[PDB]
Amino acid sequence: TXXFXSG
Amino acid sequence: GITKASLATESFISAASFQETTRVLTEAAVAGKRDELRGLKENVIVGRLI
Amino acid sequence: YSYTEKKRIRKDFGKRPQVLDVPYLLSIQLDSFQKFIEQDPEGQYGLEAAFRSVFPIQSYSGNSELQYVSYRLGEPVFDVQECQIRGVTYSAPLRVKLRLVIYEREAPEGTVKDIKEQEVYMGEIPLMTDNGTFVINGTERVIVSQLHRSPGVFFDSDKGKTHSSGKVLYNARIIPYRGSWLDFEFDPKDNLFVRIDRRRKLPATIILRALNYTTEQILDLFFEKVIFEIRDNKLQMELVPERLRGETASFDIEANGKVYVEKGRRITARHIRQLEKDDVKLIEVPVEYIAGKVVAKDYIDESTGELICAANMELSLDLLAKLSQSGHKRIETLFTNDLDHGPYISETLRVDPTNDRLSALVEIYRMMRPGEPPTREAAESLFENLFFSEDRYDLSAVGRMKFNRSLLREEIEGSGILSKDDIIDVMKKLIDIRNGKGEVDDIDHLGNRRIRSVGEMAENQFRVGLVRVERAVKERLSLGDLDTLMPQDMINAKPISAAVKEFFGSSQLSQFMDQNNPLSEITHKRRISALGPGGLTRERAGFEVRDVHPTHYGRVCPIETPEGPNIGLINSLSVYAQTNEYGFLETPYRKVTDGVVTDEIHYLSAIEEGNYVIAQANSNLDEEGHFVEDLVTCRSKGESSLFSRDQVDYMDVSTQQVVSVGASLIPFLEHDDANRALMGANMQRQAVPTLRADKPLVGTGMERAVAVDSGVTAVAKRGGVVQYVDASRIVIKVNEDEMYPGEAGIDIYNLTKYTRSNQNTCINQMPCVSLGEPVERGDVLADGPSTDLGELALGQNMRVAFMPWNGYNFEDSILVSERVVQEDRFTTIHIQELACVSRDTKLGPEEITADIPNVGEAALSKLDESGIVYIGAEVTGGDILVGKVTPKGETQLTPEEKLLRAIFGEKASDVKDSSLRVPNGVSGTVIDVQVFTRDGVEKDKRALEIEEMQLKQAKKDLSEELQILEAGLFSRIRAVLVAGGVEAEKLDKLPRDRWLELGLTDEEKQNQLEQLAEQYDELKHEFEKKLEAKRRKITQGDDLAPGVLKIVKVYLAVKRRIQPGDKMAGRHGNKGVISKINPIEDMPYDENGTPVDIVLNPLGVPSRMNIGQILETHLGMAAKGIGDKINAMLKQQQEVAKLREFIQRAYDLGADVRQKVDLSTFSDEEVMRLAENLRKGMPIATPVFDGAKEAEIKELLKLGDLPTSGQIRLYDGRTGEQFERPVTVGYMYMLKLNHLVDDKMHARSTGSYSLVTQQPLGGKAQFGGQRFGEMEVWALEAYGAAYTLQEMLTVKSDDVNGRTKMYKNIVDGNHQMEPGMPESFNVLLKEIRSLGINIELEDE
Amino acid sequence: MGHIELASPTAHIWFLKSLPSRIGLLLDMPLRDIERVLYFESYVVIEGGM
Amino acid sequence: IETPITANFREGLNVLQYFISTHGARKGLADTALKTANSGYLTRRLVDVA
Amino acid sequence: NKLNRISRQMLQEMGREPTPEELAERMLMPEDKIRKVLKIAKEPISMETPIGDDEDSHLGDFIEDTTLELPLDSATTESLRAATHDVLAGLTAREAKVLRMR
Amino acid sequence: VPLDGGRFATSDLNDLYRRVINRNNRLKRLLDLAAPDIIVRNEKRMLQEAVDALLDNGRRGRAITGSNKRPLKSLADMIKKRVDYSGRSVITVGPYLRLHQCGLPKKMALELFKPFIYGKLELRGLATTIKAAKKMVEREEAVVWDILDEVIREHPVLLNRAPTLHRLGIQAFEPVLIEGKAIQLHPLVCAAYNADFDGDQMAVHVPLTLEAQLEARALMMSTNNILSPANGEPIIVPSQDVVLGLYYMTRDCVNAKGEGMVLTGPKEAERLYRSGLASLHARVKVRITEYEKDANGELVAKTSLKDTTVGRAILWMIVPKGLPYSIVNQALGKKAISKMLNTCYRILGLKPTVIFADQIMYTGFAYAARSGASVGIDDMVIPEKKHEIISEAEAEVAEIQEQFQSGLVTAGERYNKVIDIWAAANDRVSKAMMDNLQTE
Ligand SMILES: [Mg+2]
């Protein structure tokens, strides 16, 4: 997803 | 550690300007201490040239 | 919508069909306050409930009774506009009918005879306006709804565990609406403790003792019983085989001559089943087996009467021997284990230091009220008042509901107070949880979190004030004559008014209204916060509360939240969400039966929602028909799962339901990163209204509804025809369609014009209609600020190119064309308010006068007789707005000045110049002056001219209303008079006032004429007294503060043009400051010579990952072309053939496989009218998550004539050489934010200083000084810059001698002056001396 | 700076309430006893010499 | 989560995927905002000690 | 205190705050609106009164020092003295002495 | 003190003192009147409490309060800077600036420098005296400006942005007076301030004394602090567009259009490059003499003709003058540009390296603009492989589902295998994306 597994 | 070391310093103007002002000032006043203005904080407070 | 809303609808471009329209946006406010005010509802909430709680007020003498009959609210003394003008709260008077009743007759049971009844005035309560806002002391305010865990019962545990962490502890908590918390919790030894009012832990059983439960009763409450029998001098146990499960036999388990389990054998399911089958209910046991157990009741030797053992005693060989010896044949013991039936309570009794009810009550009292010993009565009273008296403790209806649902009560109705059964049941559930039967529950779930809207909070403070008023009453009953008392004498309303005024004025949830643009206020009203009274402090607030919970879906927007500290604490209601009566947020879903999706919608709470399987809104349908997918994507519980159509109970209404109103307005949102989307959402709120504002070429389809629900735009109530259109007003004649108006006709809408908002932006409405135009119900009449033809206009559509430009767009900076300033794009109108007061001084009166000491006529030129600048004058920084003289504190001048004055012979004056001047960096045109002078003060031309003007305006306001009313009613009585008694050329002769004398043949029509004749006089008389009321307040009142002679307010208007340092942003989170304004010839341009408006750096795109701005640009390129193409058609040989082309095209975006909606044909004239408006700028709707998709955009680009990519050859305006690659250029929608260099830029040399600290201080004309903090000092230290630092610490701050010497030295040219210890250090030294410690400066 | 002449002596609070009390430490008096004497709760016998 | 997000920002993603994201996004912004405050504290400790 | 009691009474029955004139009527003879207005003196307010600013600002911090003169003034006075001396140097000693004495 | 309204405002210490004095006086009066011991005891204890409250409020017992809502401020509370000649404004990029310069708004400068301006206007005949000078300057009468220009000559101001995390949060710059209300900041220093132009503001300070000014010009100048005190690496270094420009001009290409040209030296090569037939560099050998070998001042290379690019040739012209011809023509990189700047710093010295940094900035921006770099929706290139990989992942997942319902593997094992499969698939599609862009 992006940052933080987000993103 | 850095906290305990920070709290360690002898000069009372510096210490009292850090934290725990009342405690520092009572112990200092009791002991009849003299600040030689060796460090930066003391002089900054004084308005002196560091 | 008339002319199809002038047919600018364009295309929806998304195939999802919304079964329901968006609910009223402001409803969370409007409905809440409507509920709060009520009309004697006899229903929950709304001051009625408060009165019900406070009354009847008991005697405290066994004779008095003050009771409440009903309340009423009067009409507001002053209208909203007036309230804003005079700094007065907009409110209605509250009255209450109360009857003081003697309480029964002496020795005659009940029902005394004499009652004194009166209606008492309780003061005023603030009214909510139409748009959901309040007017408090002149300023518009919004009350933000509050989110909280709320009252109820909660069962939780600790994830942290012991310090070791190798443990698990369970807890329970009862939170009431009013009163002390009640907590229960296990310790690591499995003992149970209670907290009252969050105080220190007490062993739990104390409360049971306080209830009146003996030790025996407690044990009976908490333990299932194992019964033992003594007989044949042997010991037996009444066997329940289940209880043997998981154990090994410690003795031969046998019955009826059969050994079922040999000693040392593990007891199996089969053994238990064998015992059960043979109905074995009694087996022999050894004494050691019983010695382990805890006895359930006291046993005495029933011969001697002496106690053998007490309840909860652990049995022993001795006690068993004694029990056997005494002749007892039954022994009741506790059934416990180390898993699912833990004793806990038994050990708790051991740690409990109390032994009975009285000692428990005493211990509780000591805990509550330490330092004194209580009487029995005091302890009993305190305990009763803790949880068992509704005047001191109330769960509330919602709290009782939650409690009852949690504890599995059949009904949600119940008492506000706790029962002993409630407490017992909570303890039992907690013990069950510890035992492992059942589990805890989570509190952050939106089923356990509810909203307190305006009504609930207002009612809260009202209830508090009411309670204080009751205190005052109860006191007043005892004092004075007890025989002669009216309710008026008994009631003082001051506490209630104080509580309410305090709530609306000083509360944290009461906020200065945000009105920067319509979307700002719209969003502000739908605000929700976890802060405020009864909420988180931000130290309380950790990750858990700020997180986006799964249950936020359809309820709270996951996108729109503040950036920074308040993140997750402040949020926004989802678009389709509603807050129910209990205060839970509900979201709509469509019922699905079989594979068929009904059009019936159920609003579901989160707890309600958790039961079903809910399919996504984008799931395909064959129409009805039935669900068209074999496998559907659905939601149930936390988990998201794929499901068969048969298993689908409900389905989402729209994609829109997830996101807030702000988030909705972001096109291609599905292509934009959430963090950046957050910024876009939040930043749309900050968009400043521009004079030339246009609706975006790329819209989401929400921009009309936002303009509609915020009351800035003016709409038609019913179908009708426009009679008059003006800059000032619009007159609409109703009854054109369906003839709805009856018994008089027409309506006049005055328009707000060049009003000043809270943030100094200008709010004005402009007419969107023309005389004789046909309008339907809900049709747009006037556009408000930042709105275009009923669509939301927060910015402008500009032609943008994405490419680096000479470093001027470096790091998000933005470059613009001078043409934007040329055409006044992004120019914003602003009105500032300045104010001056002239007050009584000890030295004599301050006066507002045109006569000011030592001022030229040049300076005084724009001032009238009074001293106040005249309307229309241009004022620039330093110019005088209001002239004022103040008495001098006075002093003789220095002898040199004596000489100077003598040489130039000016002669000094008693007064000093105090006039209000225009601050630096400000200026404009004076558009208003307001002057208020003390009542009965000497009034001059100042308060006479403006007054006379207001009288002329009011009188004209009556002549226009009587004109519209006359030509509104007589034009209706004429069509009635003609019918039957036709008099064409005869009626248009005699005066209009004679048309009433003419009767008509006996018929029901005559009654119509008669009614119109009564309504004419009635309404007219109401407008006449309406003028009177205006001719009263103007010539009396204003109510000024003590000491103040007069107040003058000057409204100056300023127009601000976009400049370097101003901040622009788009809806996708792309923001930047203007760094360069380069002339048109330097701008990159298309081959046909068109220069671009904005150059944005592409480097801002890839890291931010907000794709949408690009798509918006591409579509915006397409749109840029099509309207232009239409323009060309409009230019030459315009024919309906062009309409054929347009209908072809919209129905072509539709012709592309999926079509959202279709529209075609219609009248040629309507097509022509619509054609110009849509031609100038084509519009577009691209809904959230069901949007325009690439291929369709490519198609429009094809009609646009392409490039399909959206890139075009671009020429460098400096050279003429083309940029070496194709560059995307398209129309982007960009807003100018409220952050402007004009406001922010300030500087100071020297200026005003503070009294005590002597540090530089921000004056009214002197800007003040920046803070040089610890870290900056560190910065200077690391540079080893000693003299710079010393300058910061002395000459440039608090040293009077140092700064004076520095200034003088500088104007004479010099080196740094001698330092002096900073005045704040001398202050510190002197303050330490006052502390009594000797501080001594010492020499070397 | 000015001054107030007290009719009865008053113990400085910093040297009493700050822990451990400086007065208390000097006079070998626990916080409770110093509290009791200073605030008039009980009398503390002094200099008996027999 | 068992199921991934098949979509890429060019294509665009289903509403569920986005919602399930917002959490991560929010955790991120909150992280950075708290982070400035904590980092400042560390810096001050080190300054006080050195 | 009498004024306060009567204002409270009037607010109880009339249904609104009294004017200065009404309070003066109710007070008795020797009281008029002017005396009622003058009479309203109010206890001082704490300099340490909290203000809802970003960093816990105290009311006192917003109050300028009107007593100590601004530095530019000092400069101005110095320059005035100097120009006065320069001018007193030009005219004859007698006519300069007359001015200095006067 | 009397506030603006005429109302009175007092420090709480006055009230505390008042309680103290009241109780003390009353004690004296009670002693003189021979009061019983209970009353004198009460009074004495009250006095102790009042002194307590005066010294520290709240230390012993309930803190004294003016009203219940607020407690009184004692001396202890009292015990436990803002500056002149300072300003602030919104910052905007100033590409044309030299590293040691900043854009300073005219009005701000007029206010900040006002006393100096008065002095100088008195020295010159522009005004009779300082007062006349002030009265004149507010008018803004012409020649005041030119005077202000004369005032700030050689003078430097401090720029600061909060938060000041390290000493480069404050740096000294020579002010260039500019129209407009925005402060203009040099792009190379944005990194050190962590500043960007999305609405950040900066504060300006004026060092007054010769001593302070010398400190600023020697110790604090941006151009004198080119490298991090933390890592020793360059702090002020090319970022974003600059790199983009340089990389664009220094890129390998088939170069079919401009190949095969002898440069006749950097100068002729430059002419031709601007001219025609050279775009986005070319695969052509340049004649430029290179050299600058060190361990000797002589330098010089007899022959220096090497395969190169028009941008690459251009770079040598841009005053490198410190060897590393090899380093040039290796194509530009942000890391590579930082390393180039650093190496230039070490070998060629500080002042000259500063000049090099300015040149690299200028050229970088210049080419960055004309490159035509942009972003369209088609510039994000999907890989045909994606659908394939997704179908594969679906098939493997079905195989794991079947293998699960058989009961061969635990729920946990299944979950782990699904997660692993998907991780690997994500890696695959990443690789496919990068491969699709990478080759052409
Ligand atoms: Mg920034």
Author numbering:
A (entry chain M): 2 to 8
B (entry chain D): 1308 to 1357
C (entry chain C): 3 to 1342
D (entry chain D): 102 to 151
E (entry chain D): 755 to 804
F (entry chain F): 461 to 562
G (entry chain D): 253 to 332, 345 to 704
Paper text:
SalA and SalB inhibit both Gram-positive and Gram-negative bacterial RNA polymerase (RNAP) in vitro, but do not inhibit human RNAP I, II, or III in vitro. To define the structural basis of transcription inhibition by Sal, we determined crystal structures of E. coli RNAP holoenzyme and E. coli RNAP holoenzyme in complex with Sal. We propose that Sal allosterically inhibits nucleotide addition by interacting with and stabilizing the open (unbent) state of the BH-HN.
The structure shows unambiguous experimental electron density for Sal in the genetically-defined Sal target, confirming the hypothesis that the genetically-defined Sal target represents the binding site for Sal on RNAP. The structural information shows that Sal binds within the RNAP bridge-helix cap, making direct interactions with the BH-HN, the fork loop, and the link region. Sal makes direct interactions with all five residues at which substitutions conferring high-level (≥128-fold) Sal-resistance are obtained (β′ residues Arg738, Ala779, and Gly782, and β residues Asp675 and Asn677). Within the binding pocket, Sal residues 4, 5, 7, and 8 interact with the RNAP BH-HN, Sal residues 1–3 and 6–7 interact with the RNAP fork loop, and Sal residues 8 and 9 interact with the RNAP link region. The Sal residue-9 epoxide and methyl moieties extend into this opening and make no or limited interactions with RNAP. The crystal structure of the RNAP-Sal complex also defines effects of Sal on RNAP conformation. In the crystal structure of the RNAP-Sal complex, the RNAP trigger loop is disordered.
